[PDB]
Amino acid sequence: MDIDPYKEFGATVELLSFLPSDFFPSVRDLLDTAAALYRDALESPEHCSPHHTALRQAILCWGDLMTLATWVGTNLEDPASRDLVVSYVNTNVGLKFRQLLWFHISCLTFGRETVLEYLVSFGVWIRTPPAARPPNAPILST
Amino acid sequence: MDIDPYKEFGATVELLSFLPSDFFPSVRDLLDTAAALYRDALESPEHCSPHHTALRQAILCWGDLMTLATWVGTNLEDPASRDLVVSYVNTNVGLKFRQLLWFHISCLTFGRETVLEYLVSFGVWIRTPPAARPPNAPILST
Ligand SMILES: [Cl-]
Ligand SMILES: [Cl-]
Ligand SMILES: [Cl-]
């Protein structure tokens, strides 16, 4: 089987991958922000929206991923398990889940429709040769 | 925060934990049932249910778990192997993923409410002496 966590929301993995990695904030900064704003909504008994329903599972899934990454990097007596877990987290799943947190939090702050257009706008800007774009890349607001 | 993934769906971690860990099918079977019933709906871009939105996310991050497992057995010496990491996973979050997959799939097949009422009745039924219960077990259907 094969699923795109973004398809049901009107985006894809490729649309987010077209953003540069350094653009997304850290896993901890996103987690902090997700609490401060939607602490109350996330811990509620009402699916506030499919964005809330996705954000709860994603956040909990990542903690499962992080428990495993901890066990593998600490309790394997092979020393290369450190570098393998650091690589796995940076290279692979940390950035994949940094995008996912950012998408659903921004859809909740600026609305799904606003956020999507910002992707496509960012998409032309990056694809555009530098002397032909504005020095500042696009920016998200209401 | 502290997010119960069952709370927006009327249940709690303790209610799923109220059934014996023997009871929930392997993660592999549940994926097969999930792909055999809601493949096209889960891959659909249509939000089909808050259960759908949540099932999609659980499916993908079981894969992120097994992907890490693979790295360890591939990139490290064979005493630390994929079989070791996976044995760790299934000991840990393995049941947690079986309960989730079951709850959300079985909530799609039968009514959600059917499932919740089953959880309590089946849970007490297996705990009751044969002499002091009805002979026929609480069951799920429509
Ligand atoms: Cl971080
Ligand atoms: Cl392109
Ligand atoms: Cl008991």
Numbering used by the authors:
A (entry chain B), B (entry chain A): 1 to 142
How does the study describe this entry?
The HBV core protein (also known as HBcAg or Cp) is an essential component and regulator of the HBV life cycle. The full length core protein Cp183 or its N-terminal domain Cp149 predominantly assembles into a T = 4 icosahedral capsid. Due to its critical roles in capsid assembly, pregenomic RNA packaging, cccDNA maintenance and suppression of innate immunity, the HBV core protein has been recognized as an attractive antiviral target. To identify the specific interaction modes between core protein and HAP_R01 or SBA_R01, we crystallized the Cp149 mutant Y132A, which remains as dimer in high salt solution and destabilizes Cp149 capsid.
Cp149_Y132A crystallizes in three forms: (A) open triangle, formed by trimer of dimers, (B) closed triangle, mimicking the three CD dimers around the threefold axes of HBV capsid, and (C) spike-contact packing (discovered in this work). However, a new space group was discovered during our crystallization screening of Y132A mutant. The packing in the new crystal lattice, termed spike-contact packing, generates three types of interfaces. The type 1 (spike-to-contact) and type 2 (contact-to-spike) interfaces are formed by the spike domain (G63-G94) in one dimer and the intersubunit contact domain (G111-C terminus) from the symmetry-related dimer, with a contact surface area of 856.4 Å2 and 414.8 Å2, respectively. The type 3 interface (contact-to-contact) is constructed by the contact domains from two neighbouring dimers packing in an upside-down manner with 332.3 Å2 contact area. The novel apo structure suggests that at high local concentration, core protein dimer has a tendency to associate with each other in different formats, not limited to triangle format. Interestingly, during our photoaffinity study, we identified Y88 in the spike region as an additional label site for both R- and S-configuration HAPs. In the tetragonal crystal, Y88 is in the vicinity of the compound-binding cap from symmetry-related dimers. Especially in the type 2 interface, the pocket may accommodate either of the HAP stereoisomers. As core protein modulators may trap capsid in different states, the spike-contact format or upside-down format of core protein packing may represent one state of the total ensembles.
